[PDB]
Design a protein around this ligand. Structure first.
Ligand SMILES: OC[C@H]1O[C@H](O)[C@H](O)[C@@H](O)[C@H]1O
Length: 442
């Protein structure tokens, strides 16, 4: 065994030899070996998985360099090691796949010529891990991302990358704790990499390309599945809610709602004062490029507002926060709620109403944004309360019809969900999707 050094948390901490953290808007190594980190002028900081993350654009000034401390400088020359980090890459447009699809560019590398060492690179929709020994001998793992961009890993969502390297066997590439690729690495000699680990877009021909990297970390051992699973879930801080992309959910921001249980569905409104229902979202497909996805940004625009003043007007939404949900329709904002004695399926599934304003009829609108289930998924649940603070249920959908309207999956509030929070898929889970430059429909 070529690993270094029981409780998994202890193992992870003790085997860490590099851990990039960001506090007080400064990037530094908190491993203990204190490797110096040099941040160049155009390395930007943006929202991350738990705090801020490194953002790299395509120009020479955009880079972060880690100068390995003497105590870890030669860690991966002969021994095992693991590299992990959260990664966010914008969805590549159809044009850019055709134009730069064959352009491989590194984003993180210890290779300096010959350039022995390791590198994380991207080519079109491929994530590539490369190792090169002093003899120029090479080993690679080439992960081809899923065709369905809605569920792909290199399609604008924050995902967790982990690459283990066992010199006595193979290298394994994991995404969100799942094994995605592998390659035997026996027969490789010494890995004599550069004294610096460089985070920067190298040899990328697309001037508008960019990426985000967070929690860059190196371990002096090849982590096993259970350890990676623990590592991965240890970052999912169930306190802050997240949007579809994995960034912090925010107040006063327009979001398109998509139910996790029927991701191909968008939300639509019958009429002001009336109900909401699901409709099939338009889609995009490209046989030649073999990519497709349900298009985004269609359907109602929802806005989350503070029910009462929070902390110090924090812009992010915290699980347990009470809110007022509004639909932004034709420039007007309409509160979402359930009117007293309002139409309800079998008196249990309360039909939600948008901009209901009947005089003398109380309208329950107090909601609580919470995270009761599915920790790995960037979804949220919404709990509606009446005037007595009693639960009216979680927001979801019910199939049926109102009057002479066609059968529909109508937005409702129901306590039924609380009895099924353990199911794999539940109709009360929602994705809050904000428009983002990282995703443009073709
Ligand atoms: O699957 C159950 C179905 O009926 C229930 O009463 C609720 O409306 C939702 O849970 C809906 O999906």
């Amino acid at each position: 065994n070529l690993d270094c050094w029981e409780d998994i948390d202890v193992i992870l901490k003790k085997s860490t030899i590099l851990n990039l953290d960001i506090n007080n808007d400064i990037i530094s190594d908190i491993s203990g070996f204190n490797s110096s980190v040099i941040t160049y002028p155009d390395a930007q900081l943006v929202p991350g998985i738990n705090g801020k993350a490194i953002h790299l654009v395509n120009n020479e000034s955009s880079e972060v360099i880690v100068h390995k401390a003497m105590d870890i400088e030669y860690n991966d020359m002969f021994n095992n090691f693991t590299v992990s980090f959260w990664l966010r890459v914008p969805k590549v447009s159809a044009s850019h796949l055709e134009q730069y699809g064959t352009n491989e560019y590194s984003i993180i590398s210890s290779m300096k010529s010959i350039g022995s060492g390791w590198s994380v690179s991207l080519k079109g929709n491929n994530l590539i891990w490369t190792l090169k020994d002093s003899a120029g001998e090479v080993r690679q793992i080439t992960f081809r991302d899923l065709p369905d961009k809605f569920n792909a890993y290199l399609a604008n969502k924050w995902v967790f990358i982990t690459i283990t390297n066992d010199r006595l066997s193979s290298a394994n590439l994991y995404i969100n704790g799942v094994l995605m690729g592998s390659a035997e690495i026996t027969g490789l000699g010494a890995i004599r990499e550069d004294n610096n680990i460089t985070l920067k877009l190298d040899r990328c021909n697309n001037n508008n390309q960019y990426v985000s990297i967070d929690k860059f970390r190196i371990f002096c051992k090849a982590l096993n599945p259970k350890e990676i699973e623990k590592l991965y879930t240890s970052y999912l801080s169930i306190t802050f809610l997240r949007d579809f992309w994995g960034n912090p959910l925010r107040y006063d921001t327009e979001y398109y709602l998509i139910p996790v249980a029927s991701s191909s569905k968008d939300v639509q409104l019958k009429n002001i004062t009336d109900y909401m229902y699901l409709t099939n979202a338009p889609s995009y497909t490209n046989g030649k490029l073999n990519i497709y996805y349900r298009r985004l940004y269609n359907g109602l625009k929802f806005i989350i507002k503070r029910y009462t003043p929070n902390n110090e007007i924090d812009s992010f939404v915290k699980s347990g926060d009470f809110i007022k949900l509004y639909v932004s329709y034709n420039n007007n904002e309409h509160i979402v709620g359930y009117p007293k004695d309002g139409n309800a399926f079998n008196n249990l599934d309360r039909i939600l109403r948008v901009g209901y304003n009947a005089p003398g009829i109380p309208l329950y609108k107090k909601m609580e944004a919470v995270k009761l289930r599915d920790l790995k998924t960037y979804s949220v649940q919404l709990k509606l309360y009446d005037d007595k603070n009693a639960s009216l249920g979680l927001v979801g959908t019910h199939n049926g019809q109102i009057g002479n309207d066609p059968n529909r999956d109508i937005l409702i509030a129901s306590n039924w969900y609380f009895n099924h929070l353990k199911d794999k898929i539940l109709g009360c889970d929602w994705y809050f999707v904000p428009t983002d430059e990282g995703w443009t429909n073709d």
